[PDB]
């Protein structure tokens, strides 16, 4: 700490001691069903852009390594999460949205975009988390005559809110004269076909898009990845894993009156203080393991090599991981005497340390 090969006389704050964790704890809900990711990635025809199909996924074990074996994609673009970490972490709800768009507007499926699909057909929220999967579908969704089974909205009278779907087909009005159900002058049908052909360029090919949106909330967890749950041990400094988030601390029984809809407790500094076990309905407190400061009391190297260690702010008659108790911590390696001299090396509340012949040792005194 001093970056020197010799030390003077005094007290020095060197390092900090910390009780290391011993065991590991994984706590996940007891679910055995497998998620229907196989039923969403293959279909004869996907839904259109304006009528995109949302699938509700819950109460199953989700393996994301089988997504790669179900479709030949490249753009596995995730926004609030990494693709490699989707099995370790846990959440509460999955929604899968399926539609077929053109190749030039794949970049419009992103948060905070402006265009044709994003403004009028399918909008993603600004704080969106999840993954967007898109792959080419030239073999299945292209015909030489021209596809008329896929539609997109041309224009609307207002913008679209995120995750809003409309089905209605009304003739657009762009003037004072009403349409009255006739698509004549200033009257256009909003549904326009894509018209996919195999002779088109690479930017006009059909693309099958599957968008996974993950609910990262404080609801109880229903759907997430496979991790084996171990036994729960209390009053030990362990590493815990409660529904995805990890930490190091000691778990005790809690007298906090959690409401039935609540899951987590928080402190002033937005750290987790109380947690609910996912398997049994109980509340556990999270408090860190033992820590503190370490001070070293020494004379000079030209005098002696003996040191005394002060563990600041702990009660080492109880937890210690010549012993004297002080108001400034506790003292190891210095023998207390019932005398009174001038203060040589200060320690704390009226206690000083010196190095005298009463055979040489470090003494402590008032």
């Amino acid at each position: 700490t001093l970056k020197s090969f010799t030390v003077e006389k005094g007290i020095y704050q060197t390092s900090n001691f910390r009780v290391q964790p011993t065991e590991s704890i994984v706590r996940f809900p007891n679910i055995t069903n497998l998620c229907p990711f196989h039923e969403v990635f293959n279909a004869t025809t996907f839904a259109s852009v304006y009528a995109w199909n949302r699938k509700r996924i819950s109460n199953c074990v989700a393996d994301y390594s089988v997504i790669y074996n179900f479709a030949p994609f490249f753009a596995f673009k995730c926004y609030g999460v990494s693709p490699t970490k989707l099995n370790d972490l846990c959440f509460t709800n999955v929604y899968a949205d399926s539609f077929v768009i053109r190749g030039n507007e794949v970049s419009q499926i992103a948060p905070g975009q402006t265009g044709n699909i994003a403004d009028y057909n399918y909008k993603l929220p600004d704080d969106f988390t999840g993954c967007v999967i898109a792959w080419n579908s030239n073999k299945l969704d292209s015909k030489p005559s021209g596809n008329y089974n896929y539609l997109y909205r041309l224009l609307r009278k207002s913008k679209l809110k995120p995750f809003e779907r409309d089905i209605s087909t009304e003739i657009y009005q762009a003037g004072n004269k009403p349409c009255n159900g006739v698509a004549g002058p200033n009257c256009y049908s909003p549904l326009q076909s894509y018209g996919f052909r195999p002779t088109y360029g690479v930017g006009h090919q059909p693309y099958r898009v599957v968008v996974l949106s993950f609910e990262l909330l404080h609801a109880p967890a229903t759907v997430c990845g496979p991790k084996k749950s171990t036994n729960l041990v209390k009053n030990k400094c362990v590493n815990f894993n409660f529904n995805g988030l990890t930490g190091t601390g000691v778990l005790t029984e809690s007298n906090k009156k959690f409401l039935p809809f609540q899951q987590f407790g928080r402190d002033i500094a937005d750290t987790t203080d109380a947690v609910r076990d996912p398997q049994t309905l109980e509340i556990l407190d999270i408090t860190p393991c033992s820590f503190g400061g370490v001070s070293v009391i020494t004379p000079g190297t030209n005098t002696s090599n003996q040191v005394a260690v002060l563990y600041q702010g702990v009660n080492c008659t109880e937890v210690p991981v010549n012993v004297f108790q002080t108001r400034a911590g506790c003292l190891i390696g210095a023998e207390y005497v019932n005398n009174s001299y001038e203060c040589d090396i200060p320690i704390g509340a009226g206690i000083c340390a010196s190095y005298q012949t009463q055979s040489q040792s470090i003494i402590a005194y008032t």
Partner: protein
């Protein structure tokens, strides 16, 4: 606003005004001397029980070493301030068991052996008036481990690497120094501050004090009972005003409130995101791959380092102000108590 009462003193070139009586006035001056000693652990505050964040924090150089050096210098300076204010006497003097000092009553400022902390009545009132912030100078990990009632601010400060160090001199030693100064001043006068303590009766000492201010010493020897009664009434008025009014000690309370508020703001700054996706470190570790979490952790590291640097700078400025006040208090201890001052309004 009103500046004061309107007056017009009657000046004439052959007229003078001379007092025919006097009053004895006892006034109270309060000066801060020291403040709260703090120590901050960087690895526990910025990252906390994490290895990747510690390895990214070691790449920033020696910001935390000089922050720790500044805090250690402040902590040594506070004990130096207390030592230069109070530890001025070479020997611990004791008052005699007889309590007759010419009719002057010193019972409310001299200590009593009825309690283990030998403090006077006025010292007890001053200690009861200032509501402390319950700092961590006494170890409190046993109370922080046992989850009772609700989590306090002291445990939240302690769990994030902020620790309050106890002062070198306890309150009993400050009270003993004050009692030694009082005994020397009452018995010897100003002679104990310039060498050995030469005893003198209190009436003759107060007659010397009247010769200091330009009054003939026969005035005390003719009005000793009146002067003793005026001093006793002034001391009783001081005791009444300290038992009744609670706003006189606002400087020490302001010191305690500032030292609590800085640590509370330092704890509250840990819930900020600083442009990252989350303020929680473990969620960033468990939700992202290596490079993106490195970016988010570096944003959090820069924000927490800036907040800690701001705290250390404000502590240094407050320590400079407290050192100036302690130098003034030591000068007033040397010049008002150990002697008689001819300086006006000092």
């Amino acid at each position: 606003m009103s500046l004061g009462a309107e007056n017009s003193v009657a000046y004439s070139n052959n007229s003078i005004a001379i007092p025919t009586n006097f009053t004895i006035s006892v006034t109270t001056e309060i000066l801060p001397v020291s403040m709260t000693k703090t120590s901050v652990d960087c690895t526990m505050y910025i990252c906390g029980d994490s290895t990747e964040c510690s390895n990214l924090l070691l790449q920033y150089g020696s910001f935390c070493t000089q922050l720790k050096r500044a805090l250690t210098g402040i902590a040594v300076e506070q004990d130096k301030n207390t030592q230069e204010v109070f530890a001025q006497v070479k020997q611990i003097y004791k008052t005699p068991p007889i309590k007759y000092f010419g009719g002057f009553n010193f019972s409310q400022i001299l200590p009593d052996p009825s309690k283990p902390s030998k403090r006077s009545f006025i010292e007890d009132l001053l200690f009861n008036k200032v509501t402390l912030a319950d700092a961590g100078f006494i170890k409190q990990y046993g109370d922080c481990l046992g989850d009772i009632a609700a989590r306090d601010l002291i445990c939240a400060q302690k769990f994030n690497g902020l620790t309050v160090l106890p002062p070198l001199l306890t309150d009993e030693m400050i009270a003993q120094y004050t009692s030694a100064l009082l005994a020397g001043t009452i018995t010897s006068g100003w002679t104990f501050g310039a060498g050995a303590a030469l005893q003198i009766p209190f009436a003759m000492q107060m007659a010397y004090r009247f010769n200091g201010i330009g009054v003939t010493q026969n005035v005390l020897y003719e009005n000793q009972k009146l002067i003793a009664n005026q001093f006793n009434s002034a001391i009783g008025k001081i005791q009444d005003s300290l038992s009744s009014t609670a706003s006189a000690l606002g400087k020490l309370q302001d010191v305690v409130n500032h030292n609590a508020q800085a640590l509370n703001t330092l704890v509250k700054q840990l819930s900020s995101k600083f442009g990252a996706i989350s303020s929680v470190l473990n969620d960033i570790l468990s939700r992202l791959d290596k490079v993106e979490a490195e970016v988010q952790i570096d944003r959090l590291i820069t924000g927490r380092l800036q907040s800690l640097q701001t705290y250390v700078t404000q502590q240094l400025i407050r320590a400079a102000e407290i050192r100036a006040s302690a130098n003034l208090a030591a000068t007033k201890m040397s010049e008002c108590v150990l002697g008689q001052s001819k300086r006006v309004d000092f």
